[PDB]
């Protein structure tokens, strides 16, 4: 039983799916997390931190070293230069930075624009704030997807306070082009919006796609809360070391909510993640490479089975269409999948506003070991 505005979101298919798969013994290609660990020296650092007494509340905004390391990484990678003392806030994952940014910054009654299909937490967070979700779908292009900038512009109203942008994009694996980003900036500037970007896949762009933080576009620095995380970057989704970066005033509204949601967390992980950020670029590049190969590996397998596979330019997900196999209901496809076939995936319906080809798509995860991907493919092959 839950408050009225959270009722639509009281359960997710994500948990019903991972629990089902877990003791069907179904290969889980629905999971939002990796099989493999982060950098060995990062794991060791976290172990040494516990052993060395780093087990109490860290400073409210995050340890100084971790805040410096985040600013140093954003500067190193992208040339955006944040002040670690006032413009960087460590959070309990990107998940908390998202929740706190909306609760801290968006007044009840305001509209928040979402790009559809959207990550699972955006709508309920907007609803928790008492704000109104307005969704603008991506459009196919032809094997991938693209922003429809005119559609986004039309969606803005005087009630729009904020826009949440997620690139590289979960679930489609789209990577917003500079042109798309420039169009988003023009709109955000013209309407005087706050923009919250969700960049947790910043390290995962494939095939000459390039991650270009929106905060770097004209007019954007002063109005963007940029969110990312160690979760996927360093394969430590269970550590929940994320961060929001932006203008001190906006970071203060984020901190204003955040400090009462968790206060702080992840004490021994903060020095370990700071170390990873400072030192593990080469490991991250090898991760990205390993995932590009696994993407190709899964795509090739789905394709040989007879799925119509869409391009993925980043993240560790790709979307595929089972219509060529004879499966026209993808929510029912995925529902039946573990018991019929012994694989789990997520239907695209999970990421879409309840009232285009979207309803047919399935999201598959490829951050699994080689062998597991292969086994998934073998199991799925019975559909042919």
| CA distances in angstroms from 119 to 159, 265, 357, listed in the order given | 22, 23, 18
- Residue 149 sits in the site that holds its own copies (CB under 8 A): no
- Residue 146 sits in the site that holds Na ion (CB under 5 A): no
From 54-62, 208-216, 276-284, 303-311, give the range in contact with its own copies by CB under 8 A. Answer: 54-62
- Residue 162 sits in the site that holds its own copies (CB under 8 A): no
Binds 191, which of Cl ion, Na ion, its own copies, none (CB < 5 to 8 A, cut-off by type)?
Answer: Na ion
Q: Is residue 110 marked as binding?
A: yes
Number of residues that bind its own copies (CB under 8 A): 72
- Residue 10 sits in the site that holds its own copies (CB under 8 A): yes
Cα–Cα dist 228/202, whole Å:
8
Cα–Cα dist 300/194, whole Å:
40
From residue 223 to residue 252, the character string flagging contacts with its own copies as x (rule: CB under 8 A) and all else as - is ------------xxxxxx--------xx-x
Cα–Cα dist 196/210, whole Å:
19
Number of residues that bind Na ion (CB under 5 A): 2
134 within 8 A of 159, measured Cβ to Cβ: no
Residue 158 or 354: which CB sits closer to Na ion?
158
Q: Which residues of 183-205 are buried (b: 16+ CB within 10 A; e: fewer)?
A: bbbebbbebebbbbbbbbbbbbb
Residues in the chain that come right before a backbone break, where C and next N are over 2.5 Å apart: 355
Q: Is residue 173 marked as binding?
A: no
Q: Is residue 222 marked as binding?
A: yes
Binding to Na ion (CB under 5 A): which residues in 162-191? 191
Residue 249 or 304: which CB sits closer to its own copies?
249
Cα–Cα dist 338/44, whole Å:
37
Min separation Cβ 201 and its own copies, Å: 16
Binds 177, which of Na ion, its own copies, Cl ion, none (CB < 5 to 8 A, cut-off by type)?
Answer: Cl ion
């Amino acid at each position: 039983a839950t408050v009225s505005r959270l009722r639509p979101y009281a359960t997710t298919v994500f948990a019903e799916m991972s629990a089902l798969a877990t003791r069907i013994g179904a290969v889980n290609l629905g999971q939002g997390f990796p099989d493999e660990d982060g950098p060995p020296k990062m794991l060791q650092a976290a172990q040494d931190a516990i052993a060395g007494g780093v087990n109490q509340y860290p400073p409210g905004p995050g340890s100084a070293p971790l805040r410096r390391a985040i600013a140093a990484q954003r500067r190193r990678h992208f040339g955006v230069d944040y002040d670690p003392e006032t413009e960087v806030l460590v959070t309990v994952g990107a998940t908390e930075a998202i929740a706190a940014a909306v609760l801290g910054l968006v007044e009840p009654g305001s509209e928040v624009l979402l790009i559809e299909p959207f990550y699972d937490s955006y709508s309920p967070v907007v609803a928790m704030a008492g704000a109104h979700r307005v969704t603008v779908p991506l459009v196919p292009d032809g094997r991938g997807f693209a922003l429809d900038a005119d559609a986004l512009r039309r969606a803005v109203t005087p009630r729009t306070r904020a826009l949440i942008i997620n690139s590289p994009h979960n679930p489609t694996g789209a990577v917003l082009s500079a042109t798309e980003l420039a169009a988003i900036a023009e709109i955000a500037v013209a309407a005087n919006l706050v923009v919250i970007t969700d960049e947790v896949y910043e390290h995962l762009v494939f095939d000459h796609a390039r991650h270009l933080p929106l905060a770097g576009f004209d007019g954007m620095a002063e109005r963007t809360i940029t969110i990312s995380s160690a979760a996927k970057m360093f394969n430590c989704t269970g550590w929940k070391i994320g961060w929001a970066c932006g203008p001190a005033e906006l970071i203060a509204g984020v901190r204003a909510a955040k400090q009462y949601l968790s206060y702080v967390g992840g004490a021994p992980f903060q020095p370990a993640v700071a170390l990873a950020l400072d030192t593990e670029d080469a490991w991250v590049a090898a991760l990205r490479n390993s995932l590009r190969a696994r993407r190709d590996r899964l795509a090739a397998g789905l394709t040989e089975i007879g799925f119509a596979v869409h391009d993925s330019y980043g993240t560790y997900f790709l979307c595929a269409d089972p219509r060529p196999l004879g499966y026209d209901d993808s929510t029912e496809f995925c529902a039946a999948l573990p018991e019929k076939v012994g694989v789990a995936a997520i239907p695209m319906s999970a990421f879409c506003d309840p009232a285009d080809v979207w309803n047919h798509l399935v999201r598959f995860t490829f951050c699994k070991r080689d062998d597991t991907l292969d086994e998934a493919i073998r199991r799925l092959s019975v559909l042919a």
